[PDB]
């Protein structure tokens with residue numbers, strides 16, 4: 001059969017958010033009951049569930065009749081997108097050993113053992129736990145990476161898939177790739193609750209919160225092939241994304257960082273002059289084994305609309321035409337290339353900030369596009385001249401201008417169009433907005 005078919009037909013639960021209401025679109029018609037404080041925020045494709053630390057934030061699904069016991073002995077997969085702020089060093093010390101769940105099928109203190117499955121978080125650990133009615137227990141504990149800029153639980157939307165083979169293993173996937181496993185033969189009857197509960201349980205930190213989207217369950221163990229398809233199916237190409245996976249926006253400030261050189265910030269020569277990469281400061285913690293380049297230094301960039309013309313859509317769309325500005329000192333300075341302005345031999349046009357020489361036209365119309373790399377939250381920008389000719393994608397070039405040090409200078413180039421299939425490319429950018437989910441220790 002076809003992957004898309006298989007995925008469809010094995011779906012037994014699918015939580016869709018349409019019209020600001022959470023329901024089950026799988027066909028089974030499971031009763032969803034959202035409590036007063038489950039929030040609704042921006043998502044991978046739509047709005048997503050956002051849970052805070054309290055008894056009223058919660059979404060409960062009461063299994064329909066038909067699916068009551070599909071995980072008792074049989075195979076099943078759980079999948080969902082998950083987003084979890086980056087734990088601060090301080091919260092690691094004080095709450096590091098506080099394992100709380102966020103999604104569970106296990107009725108707790110009541111006298112029903114806890115039989116069932118649970119998804120839970122413990123410092124920087126993501127854990128899946130299975131428990132049969134005799135109380136036997138199998139667990140995959142996934143230990144996030146130490147480098148927080150590149151980790152799965154340091155604020156970005158990530159896609160989780162856990163498959164359960166009762167004659168063999170239980171595997172845990174992150175963004176389509178195996179991140180952990182455990183052998184689960186030796187489990188007997190999974191005897192859960194009739195409710196699947198999304199909600200922070202027993203979490204000791206009043207501020208903790210997490211976001212979940214697309215909560216789905218299949219009555220089969222998905223194979224890696226199916227999983228990558230599942231995973232890329234939610235990755236809609238028409239809407240651009242910020243570094244955290246949320247909708248790219250007009251009129252908000254973003255720090256630019258090059259995917260190819262993610263230790264680098266952009267910096268500005270001077271108003272009217274050029275831009276270049278610099279090294280991003282540091283944060284390290286041997287004792288907690290966590291490090292990351294620090295965010296929020298460098299240039300602030302704001303995207304404006306060039307035409308008005310769709311409606312107030314706050315989100316940028318691939319192909320929208322835009323104007324880029326730098327937000328340096330409460331003033332706003334446009335980014336462009338002045339006609340016949342300094343460029344490198346091969347014709348790499350150097351970008352200027354705030355250029356205003358009387359009499360010289362300034363090319364400055366850009367198009368925001370996604371040309372490569374569907375799973376990275378990165379964007380590409382293409383610059384045109386007044387005749388709608390390409391001055392090519394924005395990226396960098398190494399060299400010197402005057403007596404200035406050798407630098408990786410921001411420029412526009414048509415070169416990049418010939419290398420769109422590479423792994424790593426100089427025109428790929430990360431648009432980072434400041435966020436409560438990430439504060440630099």
Ligand SMILES: CC(=O)N[C@H]1[C@H]([C@H](O)[C@H](O)CO)O[C@](O)(C(=O)O)C[C@@H]1O
Nearest residue numbers: 273338340341342343350357360401402
């Ligand atoms: C010393 C010098 O050449 N400085 C800059 C000049 C002048 O500011 C400009 O010529 C005034 O009209 O601009 C360039 O030539 C230009 O237009 O790209 C590049 C150069 O960085």
